[PDB]
From Swiss-Prot, chains A, B:
Gene3D superfamilies: Winged helix-like DNA-binding domain superfamily/Winged helix DNA-binding domain. It comes from Bacillus subtilis (strain 168). This is Putative HTH-type transcriptional regulator YwnA. Pfam families: Rrf2. It comes from the Bacteria. Keywords: DNA-binding, Transcription, Transcription regulation. GO terms for cellular component: cytosol. Residues 21-44 bind DNA. Residues 1-116 form the HTH rrf2-type domain. The gene is ywnA. The keyword Transcription applies. One of its GO terms (molecular function) is DNA-binding transcription factor activity. One of its GO terms (biological process) is regulation of DNA-templated transcription.
């Protein structure tokens, strides 16, 4: 999951130590292209602000105001018979109920919530 | 997801028409190895009983007594720094909260619930 990697990244950025992306990948023990990518997305989602002429970036807001769900989206990625299709629709909506559930927890926790 | 495929399969079996696995794959428009596999698992999970000398199989219980979660399980499949690991643990448990959530909806619906 990219969520986890996005979380480690954000955690370290929490400390706000002008930590470069490289160091983060090292510290996170992950490829630094992934890290930079994750970081462009997070910024694209305005979760992270950057201040060129300064390595890395930093939280646009406070960790207590950053939901995991909020993080998720930012890094978020037969049959033919008529009967089959029908059922398909049933299925389709259920997966939306479970989906909303998944999504509802992620909105319950905060970045701060994990950092402890 | 194998859950969906497992659901289509169970739905048709609902009708209990001595439907062979082949026909099911046809009807479901999926490979018949997958179907048979899914069907061995479902039986292994005693969701489906079989009566050799009869194509296909059938529900061991009533559709209203078959939770999707119940179906799910049957077909259910760095860092080095000390800080990283810590966070890992935080993450680990959260994913268990979301997980339980996912799992809690699947237990709310029934096979019958989708068949309508």
């Amino acid at each position: 999951s990219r969520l986890a990697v996005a979380i480690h990244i954000l955690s370290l950025i929490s400390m706000d130590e002008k930590t470069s992306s490289e160091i983060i990948a090292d510290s996170v023990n992950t490829n630094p292209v992934v890290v930079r990518r994750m970081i462009s997305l997070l910024k694209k989602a305005d979760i992270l602000t950057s201040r060129a002429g300064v390595p890395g970036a930093s939280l646009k807001k406070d960790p207590a105001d950053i939901s995991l769900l909020e993080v998720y989206r930012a890094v978020q990625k037969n049959p033919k018979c008529p009967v089959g299709k029908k059922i398909q629709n049933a299925l389709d909506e259920t997966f939306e109920s479970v989906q909303r559930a998944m999504e509802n927890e992620l909105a319950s926790k905060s970045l701060k919530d994990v950092m402890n």
